[PDB]
Amino acid sequence: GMDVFSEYLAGIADPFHRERTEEVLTWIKNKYPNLHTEIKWNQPMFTDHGTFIIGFSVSKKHLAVAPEKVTIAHVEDDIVKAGYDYTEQLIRIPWNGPVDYTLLEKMIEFNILDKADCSTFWRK
Template structure:
């Protein structure tokens, strides 16, 4: 989480900062083999140099971006969870709960699907 400290310190809203820190810490603890990185001013996790999942903060939500293949893999779960989403990201509202089982499915899929990937993006 040291890599994310400066990013977190720049989040003005204490609730947003706390939620973001909670989610990033959960990923770090659940998937300790992933590397923590800041790229394009966003916290993300990588595995052997390939992107696994990234996060960004906006006024109304925490955005979770597992790449489109990761989104497609859990599309039904996203709908059941009731999250607003696009082809590339899920929006977790600040005043809602985090579906950690959804995050886990996204991350596990990307780790397995990109095991032999030699590029950052698919």
Template sequence: MEVFAEYLAHIDNPQHRDRTEEVLAWVTRKFTNLKPKIAWNQPMFTDHDTFIIGFSVAKHHLAVAPESAGINHFSDEIVQAGYDHTKQLVRIRWDSPVDFSLLEKMIEFNILDKADCSTFWRK
């Protein structure tokens, strides 16, 4: 989690910082094969130098970015979890619980779907 320390330190709201740290720590523990890094001023995780998932903090939500393929694949489950989404990200409101089982499925999907991907982003 040291890689995310400076990012987390710049989150002013303590509840937002704690929630973000909780999610990043969970991903780090659950997916030890993924490389945590900061890119484009956002925490993210990669596998063989390809993007798997990224996170960013906004005023009203934690944004989760599994790329559009992940959004499309899990759109029904995202809505069932009570989250809204765009083509590229899921918004988890600060006052909503994190659905870690859905997060796990999105990460596992990207790991498998991008196993043979040789670029950072999907083409």
């Protein structure tokens, strides 16, 4: 549960950054209650049957969201429309603009379905 994330959240200095980050994680916890909460590489992530679903990290300018490369590709048009800067591995959600929860839903739900038979942590 969310207690897994408490120490990580406390270490976020900026209180608004901490608040939003907590909100996003809690939203996923409550909407996808079968996902497992884990801290790995000192980053909060959600897993399903031991496979990676979605992970997060914080920087001074953004919350970074990592759904794996194939999933960035899957929702690329939606990322461009939202305006987020992205790489092959992640999207950058600036603290001074909104969280696109629709986009997060699509990524999480795609990964749950698409990785149902995935036997490794990361896609191979």
